[PDB]
Amino acid sequence: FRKMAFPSGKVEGCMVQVTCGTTTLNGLWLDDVVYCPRHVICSNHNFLVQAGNVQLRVIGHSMQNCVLKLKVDTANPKTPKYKFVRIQPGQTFSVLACYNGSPSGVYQCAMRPNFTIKGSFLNGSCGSVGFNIDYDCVSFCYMHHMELPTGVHAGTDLEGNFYGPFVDRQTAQAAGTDTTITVNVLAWLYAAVINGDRWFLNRFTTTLNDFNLVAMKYNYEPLTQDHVDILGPLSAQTGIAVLDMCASLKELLQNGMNGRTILGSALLEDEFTPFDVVRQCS
Amino acid sequence: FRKMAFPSGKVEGCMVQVTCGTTTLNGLWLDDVVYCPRHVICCEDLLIRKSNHNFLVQAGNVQLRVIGHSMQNCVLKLKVDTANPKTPKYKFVRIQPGQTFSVLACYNGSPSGVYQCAMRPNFTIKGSFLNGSCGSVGFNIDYDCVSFCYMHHMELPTGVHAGTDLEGNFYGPFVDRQTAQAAGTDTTITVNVLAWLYAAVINGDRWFLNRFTTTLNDFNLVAMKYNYEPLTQDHVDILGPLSAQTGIAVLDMCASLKELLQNGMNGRTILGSALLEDEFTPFDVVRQCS
Ligand SMILES: *[C@@](O)(CO)[C@H](C[C@@H]1CCNC1=O)NC(=O)[C@H](CC(C)C)NC(=O)c1cc2c(OC)cccc2[nH]1
Ligand SMILES: *[C@@](O)(CO)[C@H](C[C@@H]1CCNC1=O)NC(=O)[C@H](CC(C)C)NC(=O)c1cc2c(OC)cccc2[nH]1
C-alpha cells in the first residue's frame, strides 16, 4: 500500500500570493476572502494580493488569532464547497506545497501526537494548506507557519489556532516527545490481515485500560473511544475484535517480529488511518 | 523529504468516464479526442463492428457526443463534438526505466488520489489501482506543459501494475488480455538510490558515510552482484548538482552504498526507511530540496 494524496485541483484554484513590504507568502482565496499567516506583516493599501500576476484589490482586513483575513473585491469563481475543520493527532491530510502562490507538489502528511507534521517545506512555503476531500467538499485543516530546529513543521488550523504549544515568533521552539500513533498501527495490522498476512494474530485479548497502560510504556499513544470506533469497519470486515488486535500488537511490542515481516516490512507503519486503509483496500 | 507528486489540477480537468456496453473505465479528454484503453470494447474486427453510438462518454454530468473512433495499438481514440476547454499544453512521451511520474488514480471518470511512481527496470510499476482504475494516467509537469507517459491497463498476479504509453504501446512484455502474466526479474535503480542518499545527507542523515572512494568499474561489479542496475558516466554527471551541493563526490557516495549492500543497515533507518529507496530520480531530489 502507498501514501496517496487527494487530487489537488480544487485547492490549486484557490492559491494566491500575499505580500507586505518585501515579505511574500501564500494565501487561500475562498469567495471574496484571502486567508494567510498574520506574520506577513513583519492599512488595506499595504497588502499586495496576487493571483498569478493579477492583483486582487484588498478592501478590508482583520485578524483571527494567527491568521489574517483579507477582504478582496473579487469572489473566486473556482471556490469549491469547503469547510474549516480542526483535526486530531493521528489524522492524515494532503499538503499542497506552494511558493509565490504557485503549487509545487502534493504529498500526504499525518499530525503527530505532539502536534507537528513531518512535512517538506522550503523558504516561502508559509500559507500552504493541508486538506481532505470528501464528496467534492474540501475540508481545510492546516495552514503552514513554522519549521522547528528538529526539522519537523508546525502551523495552525484555518481559524488561526496553532496545533500544539507553538507561537508564530522567530524563536527556536521544541515539540513534546513524539509517540507512535497506536490507532494507525492497528489499522495497518488490519490491512495486513485483509491481505492474508496474519501470523501475528494470537488467541489472547485485553481490556482497553490494560492495553493503554502497556502502550504508554512503549511510547505508544493510548487509544481513545473514538479510536476504537473508527477501527469498527475493519474489525467487522476481518472478524477480528478491536481488543483482540490490541492483544496481538501488545505481544508484538513485548516480543518483536523476530525476523518476520508484515506487509513486507519489519517496521510497523503509523501514518495510515483506518479510513486510509478502507479508502485504499476499497 | 517526502514522496512528492505533481499538482494534478491540469489532468483532473481532462478525466472522463467511457462506457461501452457492460464495461466502464476512464478516458483522457484532450481538445476534441478522448483516449482510453481499447479493451473497453471487449481486435480489428471487433472495432469495425462497433459504431459511434456504442460509446458513452461522460464528463461529470454532461454527455459528450462521439463523432468518430479509431485504434492506435492498445489505445482507443474517440473524436467528440466538443473540445475540452481545460486542455493544458501537453505532449505524449515514452519514459525510460528508472524515471518517475505522478499517477492520478481515477474511478468512473472521477479523480481519486495522486501519488508518485517509478517505471521499474522490468517495465512494471508498483501502483495502487483497484477495479475500475483502467484509463488512469501518469504524467510529469514542466512549466505548465503536462507530459503524459502512462495509461493504466492491468495488475499482475504479484500485485504490480502494467500499462501503455499514450500511443498504446505496452511498457514491457505485456498484453491487454485476461491472462495471468509474469514480469521479468526486477533490479534496483542504482542512480536513484544514490540520489536518495544525497537527499538523506541534505536532510541531516549521515551515519552511512565513510572516508572511502571506489572506482566506477569496481562499484559496478558489486552492484551487478546485488541485482542493481549499472551506473553509467552519464549518471555520474546527472548527479553532479547533488555532489556539488553536499561536497561528496559520486564515487565516494558509491563506496557508502557498497558498504550498505555488503553489511546491511544494522537495524538503523535512512529518512525513516529501513530499505534503500530507489524511486527518487536526481531531478526529483533537486526539485524538492531547492
Ligand atoms: C514561512 O515560509 C514563513 O512566512 C516559513 C516556513 C519555514 C521556513 C523553512 N521551512 C519552513 O517550514 N516560516 C518561518 O520562517 C517562521 C516564521 C515565524 C512564524 C514568524 N519561523 C520559523 O519557522 C522558525 C524560526 C526559527 C528560529 O528563530 C531564531 C530558530 C530555529 C528554528 C526556527 N524556525
Ligand atoms: C481495468 O480497470 C479494466 O478496465 C482493470 C484494472 C485492474 C483490476 C484490479 N486492479 C487493476 O489495476 N484491468 C483489468 O482487469 C485487466 C483487463 C485486461 C487488460 C483486459 N486485467 C487484469 O489486470 C488481469 C487479468 C488477470 C487474470 O486473468 C486470467 C489472472 C491474473 C491476473 C490478472 N490481471
Author numbering:
A (entry chain A): 3 to 44, 62 to 301
B (entry chain B): 3 to 44, 54 to 301
Article excerpt on this structure:
M pro is able to process polyproteins to produce several nonstructural proteins (NSPs) necessary for viral replication. The recognition site of coronaviral M pro depends on Gln at the P1 position, and no proteases in humans share a similar cleavage site.
We then used the co-crystallization method to determine the crystal structures of several M pro mutants of SARS-CoV-2 in complex with PF-00835231. The resolutions for these structures are 1.79 Å (M pro G15S with PF-00835231)A, 1.68 Å (M pro K90R with PF-00835231), 1.65 Å (M pro M49I with PF-00835231), 1.72 Å (M pro P132H with PF-00835231), 1.64 Å (M pro S46F with PF-00835231), 1.66 Å (M pro V186F with PF-00835231) and 1.91 Å (M pro Y54C with PF-00835231), respectively. In each of these seven complex structures, each SARS-CoV-2 M pro mutant molecule appears as a dimer form, which is also the form with enzymatic activity. The interaction details between M pro Y54C and PF-00835231 show that PF-00835231 interacts with several residues, including His41, Phe140, Cys145, His163, His164, Glu166 and Gln189. Interestingly, in the M pro Y54C-PF-00835231 complex, the inhibitor covalently binds to Gln189, not Thr190, which is different from what is observed in the SARS-CoV-2 M pro-PF-00835231 complex. This further confirmed the ability of PF-00835231 to form covalent bonds with the residue in the S4 pocket of the main protease. PF-00835231 was found to covalently interact with Gln189 in M pro Y54C, which is probably due to its dynamic nature. The results clearly showed that the ligand binding patterns are not disrupted by these mutations. The IC 50 value of PF-00835231 against SARS-CoV-2 M pro was 0.0086 μM, while the IC 50 value of PF-00835231 against SARS-CoV-2 M pro mutants, including K90R, M49I, G15S, V186F, P132H and Y54C, ranged from 1.2 to 3.7 μM.
